C-alpha cells in the first residue's frame, strides 16, 4: 500500500521530464502538463506532505479566515480587499459595501449550503462550492471560477474533490492539499461523518522555472508516514471552530524548502 | 504504447470490483466510485470507443444542435424546452422568452468567448465553458454546473478537459468522450491549432445496476485501433459547421450493446 505522497512526487517528476515550456500571466516561465489527478486517503491519517515541512499554521489560520467570510486583510498572523475566497464562500453575489458592513443573510452562503445538503440529501451529486480569483471579478461578465470543490457521501464517509484550473506544483499544491483536507475534516465533523478521500485534480499543472532545482532535491527525499489530525472538542457549527481545536500528531517532515 | 480505451475498460472493471452501492435521484441503484480521470490522445486519431459501436451520428447531430443554441426539441433526427446545453453555451444569463425569439447579442456567448480567447491569449488559464442540467435552474439561486470544459493551448495544440460532477459510465461517458473530442477538433480547426489531448474527469463515476452484465461482457472485448476524424472543408466560424463536413475513417467497432 504505497504512501499517498508518492503521487505528488511522481507528478513533479513527470512535469520535469515531460512538461512543455509555457508562460504565465506575468511572462514568467513554467514547465506545464495539462490534466492531472491524485487521491489522498483521509482515513486515520492526514495528508500533510512530509518531503518538506508544510506551513500548517498558515493553512489552518487562512482556512478559518476564509470560513469567517472576511475581506479584512489585517484579520489574518501568517485593508479593504473587496470580495475574496471568503466573501464568495459565504456571501456569493451580494453587493459589497465595505469590510466592516453587516452581510448576514445577504447573497448565497455556498458553505452552509454544502453542509445543509450533506444533512438533507447525502446522495446529492450537486454538493459543490466554487472560489474565484479576485482579479477576475471585474474583468468580465460571469467570470470562471479558479477552483470548484465537490463533496460526496457514501457509507457515512465524506469525500472531497477539488478541481483547480491551474496549480503551482512547488508552492500552492502542497498547501491546498492540506487546506481542503482540513475543510473536509471540519465538515465531516459537524455532519457526523468520517473523512473518506481527498481527490486533487488540475488543469494547468506547472512548475515555475526557479523551483526546478529545489524540487529535484525534494524528489530525492523519502516520504514518512503521514500525521494524524485530531479535533479536540465537539464542535457544532462551522463558524465555531477555532485554531485551538486542532492538533496535528506524529508529523515528521524533512526540512523546509524555500521556493520563490 | 497502450490503447487509450484501456483506461475506460479499467475504470469499468474498478467500479465493478470496488464501487459502493449508492442511489441516484430516482432511487435507482448504482455502483459508484468518487473521482476518476482518463486522457485520450487526439493526435492523428479520434477516441470513438471500439469495444461497442458508439452512436456517432447522434454525437455529431446533438453537438451541432448545441452549437446553434437551440431550445427547439424538434430541431433534433436522433417543443419549447427553455434553457438547455445550447442556450447556456451561447446565451448564458439572458432572459428567455420563447424558442423562436431573437437572442443575438443577448447574454454571454461562452463558446465564442473560448474561441476568441484562444486567439487573443493562448496562454490563458481561464478558457472555460460550463453547462447546467436544465432541471437545476429553477431549483435554487446560483445552481452548480453539471459540467465544466477547460481548454489549454501549448505548441500550436489545443487540449480540452471536461469535468462532470457525475458520469454514467455505461451510457453517458462513451458518448461524452466522442462529443468533447469532436468539439475540440472543431475549435482546433477554426483557431488553426492541432488537436492535442482530451482529458475526462469525473466526480461520481457510476454504473447502473442493470448495466453490470452488459459491461462485464464488454470487458471481454479487445479494443481495435481508434478511427480518424477528417474535416472535409475549410470552415471559418463555429456556426458554419454542418454534419456533411465530417468523415469518420477506419472505425471497426465490436457490436452495439444496448444499455437500459
Curated annotation (Swiss-Prot), chains A, B:
It comes from Homo sapiens. GO terms for molecular function: folic acid binding; mRNA regulatory element binding translation repressor activity; sequence-specific mRNA binding; thymidylate synthase activity. There is a cross-link at residues 237, 242, 258 (Glycyl lysine isopeptide (Lys-Gly) (interchain with G-Cter in SUMO2)). The lineage of its organism: Eukaryota, Metazoa, Chordata, Craniata, Vertebrata. GO terms for cellular component: cytoplasm; cytosol; mitochondrial inner membrane; mitochondrial matrix; mitochondrion; nucleus. HAMAP family: Thymidy_synth_bact. The active site is at 145 (nucleophile). InterPro entries: Thymidate_synth/dCMP_Mease (IPR045097), Thymidate_synth/dCMP_Mease_dom (IPR023451), Thymidate_synth/dCMP_Mease_sf (IPR036926), Thymidylate_synthase (IPR000398), Thymidylate_synthase_AS (IPR020940). This is Thymidylate synthase. Its main location: nucleus. Pathway: Pyrimidine metabolism; dTTP biosynthesis. Homodimer. Catalyzes the reductive methylation of 2'-deoxyuridine 5'-monophosphate (dUMP) to thymidine 5'-monophosphate (dTMP), using the cosubstrate, 5,10- methylenetetrahydrofolate (CH2H4folate) as a 1-carbon donor and reductant and contributes to the de novo mitochondrial thymidylate biosynthesis pathway. DUMP binds at residues 25, 125-126, 145-146, 165-168, 176, 206-208. It catalyses: dUMP + (6R)-5,10-methylene-5,6,7,8-tetrahydrofolate = 7,8-dihydrofolate + dTMP. One of its GO terms (biological process) is dTTP biosynthetic process. It is linked to Dyskeratosis congenita, digenic: A form of dyskeratosis congenita, a rare multisystem disorder caused by defective telomere maintenance. It is characterized by progressive bone marrow failure, and the clinical triad of reticulated skin hyperpigmentation, nail dystrophy, and mucosal leukoplakia. Common but variable features include premature graying, aplastic anemia, low platelets, osteoporosis, pulmonary fibrosis, and liver fibrosis among others. Early mortality is often associated with bone marrow failure, infections, fatal pulmonary complications, or malignancy. Belongs to the thymidylate synthase family. Its EC number is 2.1.1.45. Keywords: Cytoplasm, Disease variant, Dyskeratosis congenita, Isopeptide bond, Membrane, Methyltransferase, Mitochondrion, Mitochondrion inner membrane, Nucleotide biosynthesis, Nucleus, Phosphoprotein, Transferase, Ubl conjugation.
Amino acid at each position: 500500500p504505497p504512501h499517498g505522497e508518492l503521487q505528488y512526487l511522481g507528478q513533479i517528476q513527470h512535469i520535469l521530464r515531460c512538461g512543455v515550456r509555457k508562460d504565465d500571466r506575468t511572462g514568467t516561465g513554467t514547465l506545464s502538463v495539462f490534466g492531472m489527478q491524485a487521491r489522498y486517503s483521509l482515513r486515520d491519517e492526514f495528508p500533510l506532505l512530509t518531503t518538506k515541512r508544510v506551513f500548517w499554521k498558515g493553512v489552518l489560520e487562512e482556512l478559518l479566515w476564509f470560513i469567517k467570510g472576511s475581506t479584512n486583510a489585517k484579520e489574518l498572523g501568517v485593508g479593504d480587499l473587496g470580495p475574496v475566497y471568503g466573501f464568495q464562500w459565504r456571501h456569493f453575489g451580494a453587493e459589497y459595501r465595505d469590510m466592516e458592513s453587516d452581510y448576514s443573510g445577504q447573497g448565497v452562503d455556498q458553505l452552509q449550503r454544502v453542509i445543509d445538503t450533506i444533512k438533507t440529501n447525502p446522495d446529492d451529486r450537486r454538493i459543490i462550492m466554487c472560489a474565484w480569483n479576485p482579479r477576475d471579478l471585474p474583468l468580465m461578465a460571469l467570470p470562471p471560477c479558479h477552483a470548484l470543490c465537490q463533496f460526496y457521501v457514501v457509507n457515512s464517509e465524506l469525500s472531497c474533490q477539488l478541481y483547480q484550473r491551474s496549480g503551482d506544483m512547488g508552492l500552492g499544491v502542497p498547501f491546498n492539499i492540506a487546506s481542503y483536507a482540513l475543510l473536509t475534516y471540519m465538515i465531516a465533523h459537524i455532519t457526523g461523518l468520517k473523512p473518506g478521500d481527498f481527490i486533487h485534480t488540475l488543469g494547468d499543472a506547472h512548475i515555475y522555472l526557479n523551483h526546478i532545482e529545489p524540487l529535484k532535491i525534494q524528489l530525492q527525499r523519502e516520504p514518512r508516514p503521514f500525521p494524524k489530525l485530531r479535533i479536540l472538542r465537539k464542535v457544532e457549527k462551522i463558524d465555531d471552530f477555532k485554531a485551538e481545536d486542532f492538533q496535528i500528531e506524529g508529523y515528521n517532515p524533512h526540512p523546509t524548502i524555500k521556493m520563490e
